[PDB]
Amino acid sequence: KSRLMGLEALKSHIMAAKAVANTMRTSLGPNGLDKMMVDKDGDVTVTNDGATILSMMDVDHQIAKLMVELSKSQDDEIGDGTTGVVVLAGALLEEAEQLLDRGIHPIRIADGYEQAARVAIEHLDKISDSVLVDIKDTEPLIQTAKTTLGSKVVNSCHRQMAEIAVNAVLTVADMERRDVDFELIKVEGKVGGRLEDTKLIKGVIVDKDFSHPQMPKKVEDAKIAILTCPFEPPKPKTKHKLDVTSVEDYKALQKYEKEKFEEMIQQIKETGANLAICQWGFDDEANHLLLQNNLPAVRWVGGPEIELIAIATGGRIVPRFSELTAEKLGFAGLVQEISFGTTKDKMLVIEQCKNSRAVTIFIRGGNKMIIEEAKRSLHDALCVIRNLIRDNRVVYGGGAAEISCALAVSQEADKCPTLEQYAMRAFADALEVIPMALSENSGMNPIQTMTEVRARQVKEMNPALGIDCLHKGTNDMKQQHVIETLIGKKQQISLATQMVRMILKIDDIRKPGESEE
Amino acid sequence: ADEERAETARLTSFIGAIAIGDLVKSTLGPKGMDKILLSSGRDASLMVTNDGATILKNIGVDNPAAKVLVDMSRVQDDEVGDGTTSVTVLAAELLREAESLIAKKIHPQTIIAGWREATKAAREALLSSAVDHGSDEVKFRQDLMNIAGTTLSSKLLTHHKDHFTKLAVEAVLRLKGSGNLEAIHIIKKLGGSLADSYLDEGFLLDKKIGVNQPKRIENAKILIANTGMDTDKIKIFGSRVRVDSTAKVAEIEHAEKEKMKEKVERILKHGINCFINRQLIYNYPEQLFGAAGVMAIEHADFAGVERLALVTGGEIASTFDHPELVKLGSCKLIEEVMIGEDKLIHFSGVALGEACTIVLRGATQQILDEAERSLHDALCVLAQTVKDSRTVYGGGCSEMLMAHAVTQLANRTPGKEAVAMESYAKALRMLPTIIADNAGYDSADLVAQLRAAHSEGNTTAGLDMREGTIGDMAILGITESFQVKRQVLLSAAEAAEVILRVDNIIKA
Amino acid sequence: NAGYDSADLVAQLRAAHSEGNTTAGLDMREGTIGDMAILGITESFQVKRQVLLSAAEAAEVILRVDNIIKAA
Amino acid sequence: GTDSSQGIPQLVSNISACQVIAEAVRTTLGPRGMDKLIVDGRGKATISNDGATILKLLDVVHPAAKTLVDIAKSQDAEVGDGTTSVTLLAAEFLKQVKPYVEEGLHPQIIIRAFRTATQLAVNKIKEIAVTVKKADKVEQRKLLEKCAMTALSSKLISQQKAFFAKMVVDAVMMLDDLLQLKMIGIKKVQGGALEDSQLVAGVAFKKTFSYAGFEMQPKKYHNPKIALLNVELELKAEKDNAEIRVHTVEDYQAIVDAEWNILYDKLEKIHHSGAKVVLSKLPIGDVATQYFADRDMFCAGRVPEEDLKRTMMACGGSIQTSVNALSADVLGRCQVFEETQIGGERYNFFTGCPKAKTCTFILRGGAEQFMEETERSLHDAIMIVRRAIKNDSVVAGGGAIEMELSKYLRDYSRTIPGKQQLLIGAYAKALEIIPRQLCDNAGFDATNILNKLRARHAQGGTWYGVDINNEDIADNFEAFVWEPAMVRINALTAASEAACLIVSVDETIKNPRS
């Protein structure tokens, strides 16, 4: 394979990282244009989501993989900003081209963009740095859960999607701890529901329901029998697995497990837990007994879920039918199958008003991508919300900060006598793609559209007013409720400039060609 | 792997739906040239298809752009009805509009809004010329007739449409508040009739009833059961494994005749002479099932028992246990009525009522299917006739009229997006173009004159393009529910606009 | 020629003369629609009819000649 | 058959083979010294600023490329630093004798004369060399912070070196006596903040496995008896493949509850091993952790062997082949165990490791792609801070002496020649190209800067040098840009013979052919 260096490896790096940004900047914002993306699997995926694009994107040019990475970083913490850091990369990338074309050295270029990004993220700090509690944040959360859920296509008619998030990070993680638990928040979703169907569950909803509703559909508080024991074949790891074809062993077996499962179920009734959750759950033969025992109990359970039933409920663990004791009883506030008005949607909420260690934010919708649309809605909404519920620090978007950032950077670039005086000012240049593509996403001529914000920032010198992000005709950011976590732009910037900077620091490419995986 | 850019993503978007949109075009509007489906790839067949949904899946839909309208149009006919042919053409008409705007480089945002903007305004305009023909129930029955009249049109049916008109009318009439799609039961068969659609007493059933067993039954009260056997009973004894030799491969099959005989006794515990085991039996079983006095009548329909579970006050459930679990079906006479050389056991003594079974005897199963969607759509659209007595005038008389204001609007209403909205008010009139020239008329004097003839208020005046003329929609009776007009747009409206704004296609 | 998107401005001026309008029309000076006060922005009918009399025919006139023949 | 070739066509191809390779490392090695993403396999994409690694990564298609690897790699094992430059110097003469080889002029003394030339420097290198240890403070751990500061500053963050340089000292202290990456082994963190680290001098576990409750399962031991276990406990334990028949009758519940129990033994033999904090490279199972969280002895599964080994070296402990732990040294043991989340991730930290010779670092970066460059400052500094420990005699870093030497040497180009002023001149200049590259891979000027140093090398000043960040004239040791003498000594002697070796080779035989 071959060594590729300098302008060669430069224009190597330049192609996709620039080229990939294009579909994503056409996808930039809600006015960002969708993309039908079809696998070799026969699949079809219509995505204006760059984070989903990058996921959908298997394309070559390892840098084009590194963006699939870089969006996911900002995807969890900041939420939104997955796509912009990508389209900002290609901006400052081509922006970097002509400085080398000028003769500005590859390590001259990157650092001029880099320290100028410091001013940017520093200038970012001037927009709104506020910090409030959850119950106050919900207003700037839902105003942003407008944008987030909405830039995710229909926040519309939902504070149900908005304000369960206000609870989501809140319950799983503190305000001040700022330790990211979207891992503790269970984002659950079900097709056949509605976007108008969205639910917060501080406990765990287990889709498996009572063996029979003829048996009680309400188990009392706790008294959950934690059981890893077969009431159906427990995929047991030891033996050769064969069913019997003869009536002789057909009768000899059917009397066997009617004895044990009943006295198992009675032993469960004996353990004093009137719900039996069984990590190896219920076939019908045990359920007739279970029904005949009149014991409310749970059929097949996912292996880690009965554990997740433990933690999320604070449930004390009864490991196995051999360990049985009446003392340890799993936690459930109320054990019942939940039909939401969507009856095809039936889960058994283990609903913890006492110990809730996994908060299920459960959203619904008509179909797969719909709930997925609503999930990545509910995902990044809360993710942007998580910033704002922790530190509610808001920049108003759509290029209103860009000029604002590009302004200070530009002059301060000239103020720096270093060669990067150009690069730092060249830095402030490529910031303008943010209103630019958005302008053309919103369907406006950016070059004028953006300097509106400039003329605004020339006057305003802050994101408040802006251009249309939603193509609504009121050119605003604050007032258009274009509200972006001030953390995230600092995130988003630092992500772009530094990833590119190493892309700029790496000029030395051993590949069979310009790009590779 | 692959990253596709907009131009192809837009052009392939353009071509496929356009390529499929013109499959049924000459078959759309009134009847122009028909559409022959040649199947050379998967088989060798000469086929005639005016149906998009048919034409859709037959030809390769694997164009991801085609997939959209193939899906969207399919969904639309599956909802409001006869929308596939529409939607497939409509967004195909739409794609050509923005394609210029795209060529003009008009902001993808602009065409999206303006069309969707105008999409409202036209259906809005579609809301006005929508006229209740169903105020009076008899006029509603007449509303049901004309609305079903435009539905059954343009396809290939010889005498069939006449049975379905009244029936799509009657499915509504007796049901009180909705049409009967399920209470109507579809039986598509080849009988002694090259063209028939008629009403089925109970539901007819096919079998050769020979040998000893009496081939008619009187005073039937059916024991409704889904549990039974074929060559092996479902019971404790239903399985035996013995072959030690080559004689046993012969002997193993004889013990199969042991399993049938023990159930023949089991129907006698209930003592019920009319018992449906919905699983089949042969003559040698018919030899055995004729001995006991409790007969197992084989291959009873699920929906036909549902048909009976409706009117008889009985139950349609699964499996079975004892006669009181699933309520006893009852039919006055279960009879075997021979149609041609073959005899048909006929469940009868039960005639219509809360439900209907409909047996279509065509010359082909082909003629049997084209009437179903005709019926199926005329059923649904006459259920649309139920709530909305509105029928807005067919032959695209709405389209031009929908295009009238939007045109007049687009000038005024947007100070920009008239590009889209005019283009909207443009494409609406393509359907009249493809027929009026197929009609022999000059569409140029159709889509606009007759437009400003009906759009300025003679709405009955519309397309009789099977005369090659302007024609009177209420007089021609060519009109269909205002509800059949809106959503076929709304589907097609987004059918286009999706792939419009699709600027990239990633491929695994 | 002025380099301004005509469609909107046109459709603006359309939505003007769609509404109908006199006192306001597209002004490429500022570059955008503006007052027609006879500011210099509203201009002699004499030319226009003459102009508008002229090339209006030439099309339909030449539309007679698709029949062009050449001693060349 | 067999292939062979001789003489200038081979001999120039001999030197043609080499000069291709030294450009891989060319602009590399430094803050503005470039960095190499080298993809030698389809899904295998590798990044190094060091030659030896990519030398190990890249294919060597030449005896030259083969003969080069160790030569640069020779400077690798020494300081941890300097392969790239040795690669530069090896072929740096090869262009100077291309006049001679295209003169066809080669008495072999050309390589033989560069040797005493290699002698006069490595001699002079140690002469000017000065012990930093007994010279600096009375302390010599702020000296290390000086080295740490300077050696945290030559690649990435000088921002955090003000905070980090004191810890680099502290790591080296526990690093020194056993010189290891694992015992400075860093645990990256992110999201709790951006761009910071802190030294944790006991060990740390990035991984662990606990379910059936966690916040209800003890996460900490104020006297951990640390089981360092490679053992695995799965959903059900199996000593048999099969015997009889999933269903039948007596056979169904017979297998299952015992399949439970065969776990319990290993589940027990862990817990009565004195495993309270339990650590198993292979995962603890769920029902195992259902058991483990039932027994309230903290388990761990999916555990790093290094984490297991960092402990066994910090506790004097051992990874264990048996769930039973008889020996507290076969066991690990500490006076502190915690599962604490720095950044939010479950970690198992051991302080109270009796040896505790493994320093761990909990480090946050700026972004995804910005983090690597940060800790290499931490890793480099230690290596060269330790390198400042190992050889206390230390000169100016950043090629300060070469220009002086380049002068000092071709000073003999006046003194030496009946002939080899050429050789002494050509020998003298090739020194400068390494920092000149560093000058030039900074995009900045060297003949400008380096000659200005030389003008004051004409003063007789030697430690006069460049600070690669500022990229201007200076005295590196007064900037305290540092390397011990032996660093400069070997790179020459490494690349010198390399420049000498294949020049004795006009001929290469290949039996396999090609």
Explain the overall architecture.
Chain D: ADP binds at residues 30, 82-85, 153-154, 398, 483, 488. This is part of a larger assembly, with 1 copy of chain A (517 residues), 2 copies of chain B and 1 copy of chain D (514 residues). By secondary structure, chain A is mainly α. Chain A contains 17 helices and 15 strands. In chain A, strand 2 and strand 3 form a beta hairpin. In chain A, helix 3 packs across helix 4 (82-102), helix 4 (82-102) runs antiparallel to helix 14 (420-430) and helix 6 packs antiparallel against helix 12 (368-390). Chain B has 508 residues and is of the alpha+beta class. Helix content of chain B is 47%, strand content 17%. In chain B, the strands form 6 sheets. Chain B has a 6-stranded mixed β-sheet. A 3-stranded antiparallel β-sheet of chain B has the order 4-14-17. In chain B, a hairpin with a 5-residue loop joins strand 2 and strand 3 (45-48). Chain B is elongated and about 85 Å long. Chain D is built from 17 helices and 19 strands. Chain D is elongated. Chain D is of the alpha+beta class. Helix content of chain D is 43%, strand content 13%. The relative contact order of chain D is 0.18. The chains are: A mainly alpha (517), B alpha+beta (508), D alpha+beta (514). Chains in contact: A-B, A-D, B-C. The interface between B and C is small, with 13 and 9 residues.
- Give the strand tally of chain B: 18
The number of distinct helices of chain B, counting runs of at least 4 residues, comes to: 18
- Computed Rg of chain B: 28 Å
Structural class of chain A: mainly alpha
Biggest sheet character of chain A: 3 strands, mixed
Q: Strand content of the residues of chain B, in percent? A: 15-25%
Q: Give the structural class of chain B.
A: alpha+beta
Strand order of the largest sheet of chain A: 4-12-5
N- to C-terminal separation of chain B?
A: 6 Å
Question: β content of chain A, as a range?
Answer: 5-15%
Major pleated sheet of chain B: 6 strands, mixed
Shape of chain B: elongated
Rg of chain A, Å, rounded:
28 Å
- Give the termini separation of chain A: 13 Å
Spatial strand arrangement across the major sheet of chain B = 7-12-11-8-9-10
